[PDB]
Design a protein around this ligand. Structure first.
Ligand SMILES: [K+]
Ligand SMILES: [K+]
Ligand SMILES: [Mg+2]
Ligand SMILES: [Mg+2]
Ligand SMILES: [Mg+2]
Ligand SMILES: [Mg+2]
Ligand SMILES: [Mg+2]
Ligand SMILES: [Mg+2]
Ligand SMILES: [Mg+2]
Ligand SMILES: [Mg+2]
Ligand SMILES: [Mg+2]
Ligand SMILES: [Mg+2]
Ligand SMILES: [Mg+2]
Ligand SMILES: [Mg+2]
Ligand SMILES: [Mg+2]
Lengths: 107, 56, 46, 179, 74
RNA sequence: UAUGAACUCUUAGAGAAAUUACUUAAUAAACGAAGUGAAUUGAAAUAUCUUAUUAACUUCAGGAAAAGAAAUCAAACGAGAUUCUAUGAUUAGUGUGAACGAAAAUAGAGCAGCCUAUUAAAAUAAGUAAAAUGGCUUUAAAGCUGUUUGAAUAUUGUGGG
RNA sequence: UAGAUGUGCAUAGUUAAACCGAUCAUUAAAAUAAUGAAUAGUGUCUAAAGUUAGACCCGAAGCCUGGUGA
């Protein structure tokens, strides 16, 4: 029964989050014995991290991240209210990244 | 009257560069891929993180 | 003082200056008709 | 302008207005026209002089004439440095006459010729071309060089090989006109 | 002298293709006045513009630009 | 809830609109964006300024249009597209003066995000950013711009602010 | 149910200004040497008013813009 309750928590998230996790699923939620590099998502194959810029191989030009720095904060602020901030990929807007960088280096 | 109008508005498709024709072609294929779906297994694992970060 | 300027006046010149075709066929004339039409006039010309 | 005749093409360089009148010698069927696709961004509502030349993004600008002591403002105009040059077209093989600004002359040398300046696909360029630059673009697309160049760039992009060209229709009319 | 002077153009980079006499040998890169290249050399296919794309195909870099040799002879 | 009929002109071409001659020929104003752009007036005269990015005119477009998901603001904490209304604000600030005059933020009306855009668009942007000069705007920045010139390649700190 | 939210004015003065502070400012070091400045505000109503809006009412000759007419 606990499994049916968990599936209800994942389907209760906003559609904006469910959509993002569907095309950018982290290795944590993937199957146990599955590998990260294999069975990649068509969105992940284009860019592993949608928040970081990617340099196109054929043309030496950097493509902007699929989600701007403003949109990166809306997902973090939306993922933190539902306790799903651990699934979002690395981002300079993460609450733990903003704090670690301050404590490590400081002003 | 409208058939000869859309054929006039879309008459510039013959002046497309090989690169422009390539981007539009890839987009036609991308739209056919659809949106990935979340399996019940993946949904169950997402619920654990929500419950753990809310109740414990 | 006023003068008798309509003496010997012909109705052919009334239609060539203030007629209807002299306005729909001109850029400035369309304003007159559009102005007189917004006011509600019945006599748009001549 | 008074454009030259293309060496081995029955299609003449388009007119400034977009018309492509063919000579009477070339037999043409009844009710047949060479209609160039419409300019995407449409004509330029101000400075219509720029709708007939390669003006880039320049227009006539209005400002002030500031005096020396009292700084009295007077309305004046700034005109672009428009010249009339005979530019060489490798694909066509003739000197295309046009009115081009000195700034666009540098862009033609920067990209590597008039043909490379007309085949640009970036949005900033299609706006700079204008209705006239968009007609020359259509013309060089009919030449056999550009047709054989784009057919080669489509294989590098993994596109299928690419119905009847315009220059062939005029060739068939010269044949059909005999029987 | 002054901290700011008149802005001038140094020319356009071109790579010869027919060994023009009195200017340079075939496949020689250098800066030439835009007037000659735009009206005399480019129409006659005597040279070609060296665009950043052309530099990559030829494998050379922007530091390969030479100089005009007026003393050249066929 | 369906249904027959519904002339002529604006409105084929011409012409002295409601005619001719033909034919199953047919779309006002106000509002919107851009371009151009005054003067009365106030300064107790008057030139910069103000009146005023006003009125008006021209082009283009739709039932609305425009704008819009940050090369935005903040200040060492953080906010998170555009649009409308109020407060902030007879403020900061500029101007000799007369006067002109923001933004952050707050509250309310609405709320929607995206590129696989619910209409089909990018291989991530070069004569571009930027500089000198002549102007606009403005607080000297930012933004717009004629002329002459003219870059770099991502937090492993490249580019703009 | 609980928590939070929404201009403002006053409560401390002093100076050009901050630091400072029942003390502060000038005295180029400071110092009762000298001089000045300290204790009910806030909201509403009625009425009279200052300011900007046509601004108590009536009245020019004229200036500019777009159109009209031989
Ligand atoms: K002030
Ligand atoms: K500036
Ligand atoms: Mg008289
Ligand atoms: Mg008479
Ligand atoms: Mg003109
Ligand atoms: Mg020179
Ligand atoms: Mg008619
Ligand atoms: Mg009729
Ligand atoms: Mg305001
Ligand atoms: Mg005075
Ligand atoms: Mg970019
Ligand atoms: Mg600039
Ligand atoms: Mg700066
Ligand atoms: Mg900039
Ligand atoms: Mg105080």
């Amino acid at each position: 029964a606990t499994v049916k309750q968990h599936v209800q928590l994942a389907l209760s998230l906003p559609p904006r989050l469910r959509t993002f996790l569907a095309r950018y699923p982290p290795a944590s939620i993937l199957p146990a014995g599955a590998d990260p590099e294999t069975h990649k998502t068509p969105y992940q194959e284009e860019s592993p991290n949608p928040f970081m810029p990617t340099k196109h191989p054929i043309t030496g030009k950097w493509h902007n991240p699929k989600y701007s720095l403003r949109r990166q904060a809306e997902l973090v602020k939306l993922a933190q209210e539902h306790g799903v901030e651990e699934l979002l990929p690395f981002t300079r807007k993460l609450n733990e990244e903003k704090l670690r960088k301050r404590v490590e280096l400081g002003l | 009257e409208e058939q000869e109008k859309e054929a006039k508005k879309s008459a510039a498709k013959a002046m497309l560069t090989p690169v422009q024709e390539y981007n539009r072609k890839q987009r036609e294929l991308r739209r056919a891929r659809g949106q990935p779906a979340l399996t019940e297994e993946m949904l169950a694992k997402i619920g654990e993180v929500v419950a753990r970060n809310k109740l414990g | 003082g006023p003068r008798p300027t309509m003496s010997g006046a012909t109705r052919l010149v009334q239609k060539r200056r203030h007629g209807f075709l002299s306005r729909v066929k001109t850029k400035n004339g369309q304003k007159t008709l559009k102005r007189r039409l917004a006011k509600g006039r019945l006599r748009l010309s001549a | 302008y008074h454009q030259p005749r293309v060496p081995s093409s029955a299609i003449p360089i388009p007119n400034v207005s977009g018309r492509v009148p063919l000579p009477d010698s070339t037999p043409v069927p009844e009710d047949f026209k060479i209609e160039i696709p419409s300019y995407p961004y449409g004509p330029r509502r101000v400075y219509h002089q720029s709708n007939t030349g390669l003006y880039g993004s320049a227009l006539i600008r209005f400002g002030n004439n500031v005096s020396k002591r009292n700084e009295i403002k007077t309305r004046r105009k700034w005109r672009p440095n428009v010249q009339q040059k005979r530019l060489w077209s490798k694909s066509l093989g003739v000197f295309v006459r046009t009115r081009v600004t000195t700034r666009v002359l540098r862009t033609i040398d920067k990209v590597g010729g008039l043909d490379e300046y007309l085949l640009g696909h970036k949005a900033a360029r299609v706006k700079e071309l204008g209705p006239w630059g968009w007609m020359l673009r259509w013309r060089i697309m009919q030449t056999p060089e550009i047709r054989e160049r784009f057919a080669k760039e489509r294989e590098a992009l993994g596109l299928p090989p690419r119905e009847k060209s315009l220059e062939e229709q005029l060739r068939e009319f010269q044949v059909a006109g005999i029987q | 002298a002054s901290h700011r002077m008149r802005l001038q153009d140094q020319g356009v980079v071109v790579r010869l293709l027919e060994d023009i006499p009195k200017f340079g040998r075939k496949h020689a890169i250098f800066r030439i006045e835009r007037g000659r290249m735009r009206n005399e050399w480019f129409p006659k296919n005597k040279a070609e513009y060296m665009t950043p794309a052309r530099f990559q195909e030829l494998g050379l870099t922007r530091d390969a630009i030479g100089e005009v040799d007026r003393s050249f002879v066929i």
